[PDB]
Every structure is written in C-alpha cells, then in structure tokens.
Symmetry: C4
Amino acid sequence: GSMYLRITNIVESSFFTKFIIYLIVLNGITMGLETSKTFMQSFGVYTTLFKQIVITIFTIEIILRIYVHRISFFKDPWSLFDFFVVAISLVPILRVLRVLRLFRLVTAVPQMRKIVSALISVIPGMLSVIALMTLFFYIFAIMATQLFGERFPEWFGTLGESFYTLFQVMTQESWSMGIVRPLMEVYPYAWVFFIPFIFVVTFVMINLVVAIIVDAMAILNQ
Amino acid sequence: GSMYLRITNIVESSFFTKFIIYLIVLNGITMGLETSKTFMQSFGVYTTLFKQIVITIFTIEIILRIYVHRISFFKDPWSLFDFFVVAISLVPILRVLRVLRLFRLVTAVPQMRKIVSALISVIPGMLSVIALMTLFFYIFAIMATQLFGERFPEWFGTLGESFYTLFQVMTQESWSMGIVRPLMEVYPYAWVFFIPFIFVVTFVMINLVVAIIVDAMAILNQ
Amino acid sequence: GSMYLRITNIVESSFFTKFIIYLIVLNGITMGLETSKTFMQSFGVYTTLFKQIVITIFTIEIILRIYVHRISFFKDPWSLFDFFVVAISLVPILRVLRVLRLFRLVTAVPQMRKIVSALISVIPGMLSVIALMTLFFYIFAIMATQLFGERFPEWFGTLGESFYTLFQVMTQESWSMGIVRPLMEVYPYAWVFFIPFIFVVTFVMINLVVAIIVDAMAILNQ
Amino acid sequence: GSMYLRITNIVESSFFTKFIIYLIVLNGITMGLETSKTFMQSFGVYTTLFKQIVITIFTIEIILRIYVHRISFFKDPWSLFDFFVVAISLVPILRVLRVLRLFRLVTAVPQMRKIVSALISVIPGMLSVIALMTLFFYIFAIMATQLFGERFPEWFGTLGESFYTLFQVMTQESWSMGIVRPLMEVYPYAWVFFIPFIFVVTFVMINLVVAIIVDAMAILNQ
Ligand SMILES: CCCCCCCCCCCCCC(=O)OC[C@H](COP(=O)(O)OCC[N+](C)(C)C)OC(=O)CCCCCCCCCCCCC
Ligand SMILES: CCCCCCCCCCCCCC(=O)OC[C@H](COP(=O)(O)OCC[N+](C)(C)C)OC(=O)CCCCCCCCCCCCC
Ligand SMILES: CCCCCCCCCCCCCC(=O)OC[C@H](COP(=O)(O)OCC[N+](C)(C)C)OC(=O)CCCCCCCCCCCCC
Ligand SMILES: CCCCCCCCCCCCCC(=O)OC[C@H](COP(=O)(O)OCC[N+](C)(C)C)OC(=O)CCCCCCCCCCCCC
Ligand SMILES: CCCCCCCCCCCCCC(=O)OC[C@H](COP(=O)(O)OCC[N+](C)(C)C)OC(=O)CCCCCCCCCCCCC
Ligand SMILES: CCCCCCCCCCCCCC(=O)OC[C@H](COP(=O)(O)OCC[N+](C)(C)C)OC(=O)CCCCCCCCCCCCC
Ligand SMILES: CCCCCCCCCCCCCC(=O)OC[C@H](COP(=O)(O)OCC[N+](C)(C)C)OC(=O)CCCCCCCCCCCCC
Ligand SMILES: CCCCCCCCCCCCCC(=O)OC[C@H](COP(=O)(O)OCC[N+](C)(C)C)OC(=O)CCCCCCCCCCCCC
Ligand SMILES: CCCCCCCCCCCCCC(=O)OC[C@H](COP(=O)(O)OCC[N+](C)(C)C)OC(=O)CCCCCCCCCCCCC
Ligand SMILES: CCCCCCCCCCCCCC(=O)OC[C@H](COP(=O)(O)OCC[N+](C)(C)C)OC(=O)CCCCCCCCCCCCC
Ligand code: NA
Ligand code: NA
C-alpha cells in the first residue's frame, strides 16, 4: 500500500517497540503497586484507568502487528504468546493470569528473547530422560499408593498424593524426618522403597545435568 | 523350519512388538486405575479379566521369543528382565512387584532402551568411588553407633540405624536441627563427628559428579 | 620530588604492605576477641587502645597511597574499597559494618585478589539469566501475593513476603511440609503454582551453572 | 643381607599383602559384630582374643616394613598412616578411633589408593577459594554474633555457635523456617544479613565446583 509502507515502517521502527516496552514497564510497576491496600484506596482509580488505557494500546498494536504480517504472526512463537496474553487481559483465576503479560517484556527485549530461546533449545535432548523419569515416577507412585495408602492416606492415599510425596522425597525436603521415619513406625522396612528410590532419582537427575553440559560444549569443541 | 521362518518373521516384525507395546500401555493405565476404590467397585471385573487376558498374551509371546532365540534369550539383559517380570506376574509384596512389568515399556521402546543403557555404562567408573564411600560409611556408622547408641537409640542404636541417620545427614535433610543439635544437648562436641563427615561426603560426591562429566566428554574431544 | 621518590619507594615497597597485612591480621584477631564478654572485661582497654592505634595507621597509609597516586587511587576498585572501609571505621549498624575492614586482607594479598577478580569476571555472563529470574520472581511474587495473601498473611501477605517465601521454595527449604502442604488445607490446588514454579526455577539455575562451565572452558580449548 | 633379601622378598611379595588384607577384612567384620550386645555376650571372648591376635600381626608387619625401608617408611604418606593407626590401636575416644584402622584397607588396595590420591591432588587448587570462604565465614560469624548474640544466645551467642548456624544456613538446612524466620520476630530485617550471605556462599561454592571441572578437563584436552 501507500500507507501500508508507512505502517510497516512504524511497526518495525525502533521507537514503536521502545514505546510498548515503556508501557510494559509502567504496567508492571502498576501491577506491583496494586497489591498495596493503602495505595489502591488512595490512587486506585488512576491505576485502573491506566490499566484500561494501556490494555487498549496493546490491543491496537496487536491489531497492527497482525495486519503487517497476516500469517507470519500466527506461526511465530513470541507474537503468538503476545496474542494469548492480550487475549487473557481482555475478558471482562483470570485476574491473576493477567500478570503473565509482564513476560511480554521478555518478548520485546531481544537479549531476553535470546536467553529464553537458548533455554528452550536445551529441552529436546532431555525428552528421553524425562520420559524414563515420568514412567519411573508412575511406577513408584503406584507402588507407594498400594503399600502405604491406607495407613498413610494424607501422603500416599491417592496416586496424585503419591506423585506429590515422591516429588518431595526427590527434592529431599523432609524426606526422612517428615515421611520415611514416621512410616517406619508402622511399616519398619520403608527404606527399601525410598533409599533405592532416592538413589535412582538422584543418579538420573545427575546424568540429566551432565547431559546438558556435553550438548552445550559440543558446539564449542568443533 | 517352514513355519519357523514365518514365526521368526513375525516375532521380529514391527507389528508384533508394536502390539505388545499397546498392551503394556493398556495394562499400565489399567494398573493405574486399580488404585481407585470407586473404579474397582464399578469395573473391577473387566479389569481383572483384562489383566488375565493380557498376562496370557505376554507369557505366550515370551514362549515365542524363547523359541526363535533359544540361548540368545538368556544371555540378553533386556529379554532376561522380561523373563523375570513375566515370572513375577505369574505366581498365584509380589502384588506390588507386579507393577514392575511397566518397565517392560523401557525394554520394548528403543529410544528408552538407549537412554537406560547409557545410564548403565556410566556406572563402571563410579565403582572405585562407591567402594571408598561404602567403606567410609561403614567406618563412621560404627563410630556413630558406639558413640551415640545408648543415649540416642532411635537414631544410632544399631549399625543399620546409623547407616540410616548418616545417609540422612549426607542428603543434608534436618542434619542440624533434626540430629546434631539435639545430640549436642547431651554430647556437646558432636560437630567434630558430623561437620567433618559432611565435608568428606560432599567432597567425594562432588568428585563423583565431576568424574561423570570427564568420562562423558572424552569421546567428544577425540 | 626528592622525598616523593622516597615515599613512593616505600609505599610500593614489599615491607610497607607486609606491615599493613600484619596489622590487618592483628586487628582481625582483636575483633575476634571482642565478642568474649570475659576477655573484654579483662583486657578491653588494651584492645580498644589497639583499635585506635591501628585505625590511625590505616588512615595515614590511605593518605600516603592517595598522595603517590592522586587520581589512580579513585579509579581502582581495590583501593576504592579501602577508602570506604577506612571511612566507615572513622565515624564516631556502623559498629558491625566496621568488621568489613577484614576484607582489607583480600585486597592486600595478591593471590586472594586474583581469586576475587576471577569470581567477578564470571558475573557479566549471568546478567541476562539473572534478569529473566528477577522478572520471573517479580511475576510469581505478584501472583502468590494476590492468591494467598489474605488467608496466609505471614508468608504471602506482602510482595516482599512473597519474594521471601518463593526464595525459600527455590532453595527447597521446607517447600512442601512448611509452605505448600499447609496451603493445601485451605487452597487444595497450590501445587499447580509451586511445582511448576520449582521446575522453572531449577531448570534456569541449572543452566546458569552450565553456562558458567562453558564460559570457563572456552579459554582452555582455544 | 642373606635373609634380608628373603624378608624383603616376602614383604614385597603379593601373598604377604594379600594376607594382611584378609586380616583387615576379618577385623572389619569383627569390629562390625562388636556393636551387637547379644553377639558380644555369646562370642565376646573369641572376638577380643581375635582382636589381640590380629593387632599383634599388624604390629610385627609394621616392624618388618620399617626394617626393609628404614627411612623410606617415614616419608611415605600411606605407611605413615599405617604407623599411626597401629599406634592408636596399641595404647592400653581412643576406643572409637581404633576403627580408623579399617582405612588400612584403602592403603593396601591399590585401586583404592589411586582414587584417594586423585581426590587429594584436587585439593591444592581449592586452597585459594577455601581461604576466601574461611575469611568470609570469619567476618560474617563476627557480624552475626554481635547482631543476634544476646536475643538468640543458643544460635549466635558465641563465635563458634555463629560459625555453626552460618554453616547450617550455607547447607540450606532449615535456613528460613529454623533460623531466619524466628529471628525476624525480634529483628525484622535479618534477611539483609542472610539472603546476601546465602547468595555469596552459593556463588563461591558453585565456582569451586566449576573450578574442579576445568582443572580435571585440562589434562584431557592437551
Ligand atoms: C523486577 C524487580 C524490581 C524490584 C521489585 C521491588 C519489590 C518491592 C516490594 C516490597 C514492598 C512491600 C513492603 C511494604 O511494607 O509495603 C506495604 C504494601 C502492602 O501493605 P499495605 O497494603 O500498605 O498495608 C495495609 C495495612 N492495613 C490493612 C491495616 C490498612 O506493599 C507495597 O507497598 C508494595 C510496593 C510496590 C513495589 C513495586 C516495585 C516494582 C519494582 C519495579 C519492577 C518493574 C518490572 C517490570
Ligand atoms: C521462561 C519464561 C516462559 C514464559 C512462558 C513462555 C510460553 C511460550 C513462549 C514461547 C517463546 C519462545 C519460543 C522459542 O524460543 O522457540 C525457539 C526454540 C529454540 O530454537 P533453536 O532450537 O535454537 O532453533 C534451531 C533449530 N532450527 C534451526 C532447525 C530451527 O526452538 C524450540 O522450540 C526447540 C523445541 C523444544 C520445545 C520445548 C518447549 C516446551 C517446554 C515448556 C512447556 C511449558 C508448557 C506450559
Ligand atoms: C517436557 C517438559 C518437561 C516436563 C517434565 C515434568 C513432568 C510433569 C509430571 C506430572 C505428570 C503427572 C501429573 C499427575 O499425575 O498429577 C497428580 C497430582 C494431583 O493431585 P490430586 O490427587 O488432584 O489432589 C486432589 C485432592 N483431593 C482429591 C482430595 C481433593 O499432582 C502431582 O503430584 C504432580 C507432582 C509433580 C510430580 C512430577 C513427577 C514426574 C517428574 C519427572 C521430572 C523429569 C525431570 C527429572
Ligand atoms: C506416565 C504418567 C502419565 C500421567 C499419569 C496421570 C496420573 C493421575 C493420577 C491422579 C488421579 C487421582 C485423583 C483423584 O481424585 O482420583 C480418585 C481416585 C482415588 O479416590 P477414590 O478411590 O475415587 O475415593 C473413594 C472414596 N470413598 C472411600 C469414600 C468411597 O484416584 C484415581 O481415580 C486414579 C485415576 C487413575 C489415573 C491413571 C492415569 C494413567 C495415565 C497414563 C499413563 C500410562 C503409562 C504407561
Ligand atoms: C554399584 C551400584 C551402586 C550401589 C551404591 C549404594 C550402596 C548401598 C549401601 C548399603 C550397604 C549396607 C546396607 C546396610 O548396612 O543396611 C542396614 C540398614 C537396615 O536397618 P535395620 O537395622 O534392619 O532396621 C531394623 C529395625 N529393627 C531391628 C529394630 C526392627 O539400611 C540402611 O540404613 C541403608 C541406608 C543407605 C546407606 C548408604 C550407605 C553407603 C552409600 C554409598 C553411596 C555411594 C555413592 C556416594
Ligand atoms: C579465619 C578463621 C581462623 C579460625 C577462627 C577461630 C574461631 C574460634 C571461635 C570459638 C571461640 C568461642 C568458644 C568459647 O567457648 O569462648 C567463649 C567466648 C564467649 O564466651 P564468654 O564471653 O567467655 O562467656 C561469658 C559468661 N558469663 C556471661 C556468665 C560471664 O568466645 C571467645 O572466647 C572467642 C574467642 C576468640 C577466637 C578468635 C580466633 C581468631 C582466629 C584468627 C583469625 C584471624 C583472621 C584474620
Ligand atoms: C547482578 C548481581 C546478582 C544479583 C542477583 C540477586 C537479585 C536480588 C533480588 C531482590 C530484588 C527485589 C528486592 C525486594 O523485592 O525486597 C523485598 C523483601 C523485603 O520484605 P519487607 O516486606 O520489607 O518486610 C517488612 C515487614 N513489615 C513491613 C511487616 C515490617 O526482601 C526479599 O524477599 C528478597 C528475597 C530474595 C529474593 C531474590 C529474588 C530474585 C533472585 C534472582 C536470583 C538470580 C540467580 C538465580
Ligand atoms: C562395607 C559395608 C558392607 C555391608 C555392611 C552391612 C551392615 C549391616 C548392619 C545391620 C545389622 C543390624 C541389624 C540388627 O537388627 O542387628 C541387631 C544388632 C544390635 O542389636 P542387638 O545388640 O542384637 O539387641 C539387643 C537387645 N537387648 C538389649 C534387649 C538384649 O546389630 C547387629 O547385629 C550388627 C550385625 C553386624 C553386621 C556386620 C556386617 C559387616 C559387613 C562386612 C563389611 C566388611 C568391610 C571391611
Ligand atoms: C578419604 C579417606 C581419608 C582417610 C584419612 C587419610 C589420612 C591421610 C592419608 C594420606 C594418604 C594419601 C596421601 C596422598 O595420596 O598424597 C598424594 C597426593 C597426590 O599426588 P599428586 O598431586 O598426583 O602428585 C603429583 C605431584 N608430583 C608429581 C610433583 C609429586 O599429593 C598431595 O598430597 C597433593 C597436596 C595436597 C594435600 C592436601 C591434603 C590434606 C587434606 C585433608 C586434611 C585432613 C586433615 C585431618
Ligand atoms: C584445606 C582443607 C579444607 C578445609 C576447609 C574447612 C575449613 C574448616 C573451618 C573451621 C575453622 C574455624 C573452626 C572454628 O571456628 O570452631 C568453632 C565451633 C566450635 O563451637 P564451641 O563454641 O566450641 O561450642 C562449645 C559450647 N560451649 C562453650 C557452650 C560449651 O565449630 C564450628 O562451628 C565449625 C563449623 C564449620 C564451619 C566451616 C566454616 C568455614 C568453612 C569454609 C569451607 C570451604 C569450602 C566452601
Ligand atoms: Na529441610
Ligand atoms: Na535441603
């Protein structure tokens, strides 16, 4: 177009994205201030007005970005994320989910965008080890629920409660004073279940970490 | 044979192993559903029937696999594991040990098989460090049992209880509020035993991890 | 100058810096002894006299060092640190902040100076990951304060209290028995907030550590 | 000598060191059995006799080893350790220190000897970082003792008690529920002291570990 060139030369301009970055920061501090009961009584209307007069800017700039790249928008992870976080912020739990638009700042800022996509690119390698661990949790979740579910309903009564207690034991939070030692007052051989479980879960996780270290180092040694 | 070629051309076919994989998954979800008291009252007979009509399939397919490879079966770690997990599932604790046949899914799936055998191949290097640690635990288990066994019978009364408390201190779970600090109310110099113990156990474990990192990296730098 | 050469040939002499090192050590042991109520009653005056007759030496040697390097002093991180730790020790919380002049010993000793500046040079790389984590804490601090702030005021009532509880959960100290499990007595789905939070925070920190390992190894592989 | 060749050809023979290894193992199991009150009542005399008839063998074989290498013995770390652990076991706390002669098995066994000396060779590099950490603990031990020593005498009353509580906070055992959170009921800004302390102590330790990883990898990349 005649003006289509102008609008794609503003949408891809530095100052338009710098402006929506200042708005993300201002909204983030606004969102931060909205936890204060005293501030909300004193200036609640300026902030809620502000929150409206900023959600409108964000929605119009989503409209513009969609126009300049009609289908390129809906195949791009970052702009897709923007689409969804402005969608959440537009409906009349959702209240809390609205804060996620502050990750909008990870999208705009390129250095942050680089770090995030680096972290994502790590994941494909871990898929194989995660699958063994999820299967491993599934198997020991079922064993623990059938062994301790009656006498210890709060911790091992349900499969979900046993995926919870086992995750806590793997994080090694009160694994012994909190869970195993109380269990051994009724069932005196519970260590056979947990100390092996601990050992396996640690080993795998260690290897997971070492795996991440050689997949990173390969591109350097070449 | 005439049909022996047919049976070895089905046993090594893709679809026969895909079929026993679907059966492992169906049995795994069945086993998962058997923790629900409500589901077991409503559909317990369909599932127990299912569990029988699947343990039979698994046993016949073990029979077939043994026939096609008569001695190759009993020298192969994965099929040996299958032999034993279908054996456990065939006897009239065992109830819980039956769930282990879900690791049958690690055997069938090749990508999982790769990850598991990678994890195994790590272990030979750790044998030397594990032996020093097991000897180290043995020595400090005996010291702790003789020092605190009377006044603190629940934690250090027996060698096994002291291999337990020392493992908890090495995992650093309530090492200080839970065990050392109570001990210092009777025996005020217990830190000499534990803080050195902590230090040694951490150092060795750190080296263990670093060891795993150079044994992995060697095949890349070549 | 005529004597300016003499004073710059003492200020940069080995024995002048060896002397102020002995004074740092003597003051450090003095500072160590000043916690003892009994020693302070018995020899408090010798030590406070000593503390004065040493703060004067340190101040004159700051004066000398400033003279020999007039502007080189105020552009040098180590001597700048000396300026500020002798300033703190000169005013008529400050009492406790005075102990920081024992890090004066890191400045004088060159091997220590090397280690410290190595540790500093690591930091620039972590700036990108720290910024994502600080933003991530900010977002989940706000979510946690709005979700649990009323029913759990002590832990999540304020943004600062939620940056505190979330840091404790990331350190994995009583994350489950101490915070999540009590929360699930009122709000039974709190794991959705924390177990994801845990996962993200661990992953990032792991990568942070792996990052530090490849930035160190690069100068070796070249 | 005429027989001196014979005795140095037995002392350095495989079977003499294999024999004292069997004696270390037999004594280790004996020492293990001596925790059992029931076994000591039933067979206490056979074991104490055994313990004497083995401490004598060990002492004569120390005598022989000293003779074959008169001064080479007292300049060799492993045999020096043997000298001292047979000395401890010869005097008429010492009772518990006697168990250390089971590390005699690390000395005899060469693969174990290799692992141990590898672990030792790591340490020289950590000396610089350990010195910064020990100075760092000293400084924050003094700060914590002067800030919280009166209101919290059990944890921070003495410098030793503050080197204890700070070590526990660095191990991250009940750092927050156990120590900081109780402190903030009297002194509401204690996080300024501990969360910075935590951060520094973690960072340094991380670098310590990364250091160990590049000092190991250097001999491989060459
Ligand atoms: C990225 C990280 C940057 C740094 C983040 C800084 C976070 C600091 C938060 C700590 C503030 C809370 C401390 C405090 O005491 O403030 C009180 C209020 C809540 O208490 P309040 O509601 O005032 O008490 C009511 C009493 N009543 C019921 C009897 C009437 O609580 C507040 O006033 C909250 C104050 C809002 C702080 C917002 C700071 C935003 C930093 C900029 C980050 C932008 C990133 C895009
Ligand atoms: C930390 C704050 C998070 C905030 C919420 C985020 C929500 C999603 C936002 C997505 C924005 C980032 C997307 C992204 O960076 O993708 C790029 C990555 C890395 O690229 P990379 O792998 O380097 O590309 C090389 C491959 N090539 C050349 C053939 C194209 O390419 C890949 O994706 C590799 C494939 C692995 C994908 C695994 C992703 C899912 C893990 C977490 C799922 C959470 C669900 C709730
Ligand atoms: C590829 C990207 C990376 C993703 C990797 C993470 C995989 C996530 C695993 C979770 C999959 C299974 C989820 C699940 O089973 O949820 C069950 C429970 C819910 O408890 P629930 O029974 O609903 O409580 C209700 C109480 N009631 C009925 C009395 C009112 O909720 C829980 O307990 C979940 C606790 C977390 C357990 C994590 C277990 C496997 C993690 C493997 C980690 C891999 C790296 C090592
Ligand atoms: C590999 C990991 C994949 C993802 C795993 C998903 C795990 C999800 C488990 C969480 C389900 C439990 C939550 C829940 O509230 O369910 C209730 C039942 C047990 O309570 P219920 O017996 O219904 O209560 C009785 C009350 N009474 C005594 C008064 C009559 O508990 C149940 O109903 C259990 C529901 C069965 C879930 C099975 C999911 C299998 C996922 C597929 C994995 C296949 C791997 C090969
Ligand atoms: C090569 C493949 C890797 C394998 C490495 C793992 C080595 C496993 C070490 C276990 C060896 C010794 C086993 C043992 O001594 O068992 C004793 C206790 C049993 O307690 P017990 O006294 O039966 O309780 C009965 C209570 N009663 C009589 C009043 C009714 O049970 C326990 O306390 C065991 C607790 C675990 C302690 C682990 C100690 C050494 C681990 C070294 C780890 C190496 C990597 C760092
Ligand atoms: C770099 C690290 C080097 C090694 C650091 C060594 C730290 C050792 C500290 C442990 C000392 C405390 C143990 C102890 O029981 O001493 C008691 C005094 C405090 O109790 P006290 O005030 O005597 O009790 C009064 C009783 N009342 C109220 C009824 C009259 O507490 C004291 O007497 C404190 C003793 C001062 C020890 C100063 C050691 C400095 C080591 C040199 C480091 C120089 C680095 C530049
Ligand atoms: C580039 C060099 C490295 C630096 C990296 C570290 C970044 C430090 C993050 C701290 C920034 C935000 C500070 C902040 O928000 O302070 C709030 C609270 C204070 O609590 P407050 O509400 O004042 O308590 C008063 C109680 N009252 C009113 C009732 C009397 O105090 C806290 O809760 C702070 C707790 C620490 C939280 C740390 C959170 C982000 C850390 C990211 C770590 C990066 C590496 C993974
Ligand atoms: C290197 C690691 C190898 C594997 C280490 C194996 C450790 C196993 C230790 C667990 C044994 C303790 C379990 C148990 O219930 O035994 C009971 C006794 C102590 O109770 P007891 O004194 O029998 O009870 C008296 C009751 N009363 C007062 C009313 C009369 O406690 C005992 O009977 C202790 C049994 C001695 C076990 C010695 C095993 C040595 C393994 C070989 C290692 C050699 C390395 C050089
Ligand atoms: C784990 C069970 C322990 C049981 C108690 C042990 C008590 C002491 C037993 C001593 C036996 C081992 C002695 C030893 O292996 O020394 C050899 C190490 C490693 O040799 P390496 O550095 O490879 O030699 C190369 C240097 N070269 C070619 C120029 C000679 O050469 C070095 O020593 C390097 C120098 C660093 C020494 C740091 C040692 C002290 C750390 C722990 C102190 C604890 C005191 C209670
Ligand atoms: C080169 C080979 C590696 C060696 C590195 C390890 C360095 C060891 C540091 C210990 C140096 C200072 C020792 C010290 O100050 O001892 C004080 C306390 C003793 O408490 P105390 O006051 O005697 O309790 C008596 C109670 N009473 C009077 C009421 C009856 O005892 C404690 O609290 C000690 C707790 C351990 C603290 C460790 C602090 C610095 C560790 C730096 C670690 C470096 C790697 C990161
Ligand atoms: Na804990
Ligand atoms: Na912990």
